[PDB]
Design a protein around this ligand. Structure first.
Ligand SMILES: Cc1cc([C@@H](C)Nc2ccccc2)c2nc(N3CCOCC3)cc(=O)n2c1
Length: 321
């Protein structure tokens, strides 16, 4: 099938965005950085390791559901077009593509992500694996370019991994509203949400004894040091995973041990850390079944299927426009 890739981001858009997030985030109280910047090359490779840890159940729990339910996804949505809000590199992507193709309705794959080189590799992989499928990769970001997704016949939008949990309620409602805005009647959204559960299990999933998550978290400082000529003493920042009971979310923090002064050279910026000051690097909201259905409703989408894994650890929602 034909491949296309459309790039709506400027060549330096990634670097401009990083400059903005860091100039802004290192000046908030508390300091905070968005989790999208964990995922450079080293960081993406560390994330792969995390998904294979015994502590980190979300990846396998979601794959367990999709292994068992992809055909039920395919029969309810009846999509001819799979839109992945993501890079399309995972096994789950092929599980859904396999199920739409088993149905015979699969015509088009639309991976939508911010890294055009990954999208190009993904498009070549799918083109080699799925004959007669057209791939229309779209390089754009959520806040501007969701309108540039092709119309197709009937579209299944896919947002897996409980990545929606990185948005707190305010931004999360804005995102779901905008996504529902670009969907057309007859489209559907497959959404993965990690579920509230025993808090000790949740912390463990974000602070494995082997230290992999700690290295993943510390890597954002390495990314800033490298990309913006900074002098974070990375090992002076301790990994801290917290359960926030009242907000029902995991939080990843980096805790300064002793006072630190950090100079970000590209930004002409100097910031100060108190001894014990913690900086927020990721929010991971955990959900309850009924609240996910209500948040989808508030955005204009109607949930028509809900599936958990055998342990009730992880949820998949299918919601139609
Ligand atoms: C390409 C990519 C990007 C992410 C980052 C950008 N997210 C995000 C999404 C919207 C807004 C802000 C942040 C990601 N986040 C994942 N998460 C797993 C569950 O716990 C924490 C979040 C998994 C995973 O594959 N991502 C893959």
């Amino acid at each position: 099938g034909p491949v296309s890739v459309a790039n709506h981001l400027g060549e330096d858009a990634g670097h401009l965005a990083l400059r903005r997030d860091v100039y802004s985030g290192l000046q908030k109280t508390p300091k905070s950085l968005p989790p999208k910047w964990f995922y450079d090359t080293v960081g993406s490779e560390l994330f792969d390791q995390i998904t294979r840890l015994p502590e980190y159940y979300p990846t396998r729990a979601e794959a367990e559901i999709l292994r068992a339910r992809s055909a039920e996804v395919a029969s309810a949505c009846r999509a001819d077009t799979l839109v992945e809000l993501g890079s399309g590199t995972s096994e789950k992507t092929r599980m859904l593509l396999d199920a739409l193709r088993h149905r015979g309705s699969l015509r088009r794959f639309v991976p939508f992500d911010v890294d055009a080189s990954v999208l190009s590799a993904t498009a070549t992989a799918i083109q080699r694996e799925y004959s007669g499928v057209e791939i229309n990769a779209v390089c754009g970001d959520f806040e501007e370019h969701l309108t540039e997704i092709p119309r197709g016949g009937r579209r299944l939008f896919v947002f897996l991994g409980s990545t929606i949990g990185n948005l707190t309620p305010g931004p999360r409602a804005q995102f779901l509203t905008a996504l529902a805005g670009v969907m057309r009647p007859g489209d559907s959204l497959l959404l993965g949400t990690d579920l509230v559960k025993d808090a000790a299990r949740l912390v463990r999933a974000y602070d494995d004894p082997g230290g992999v998550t700690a290295q993943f978290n510390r890597n954002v400082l390495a990314v800033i040091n490298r990309e913006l000529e900074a002098d974070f003493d990375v090992d002076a920042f301790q990994h801290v995973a917290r359960w926030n009971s009242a907000e029902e979310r995991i939080e990843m923090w980096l805790r300064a041990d002793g006072r630190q002064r950090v100079r970000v050279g590209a930004l002409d910026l100097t910031v100060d850390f108190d001894a014990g000051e913690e900086m927020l690097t990721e929010v991971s909201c955990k959900f309850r079944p009924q609240a996910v259905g209500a948040e989808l409703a508030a955005a204009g989408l109607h949930r028509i299927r809900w599936w958990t894994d055998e342990a009730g650890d992880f949820g998949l929602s299918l919601a139609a426009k």
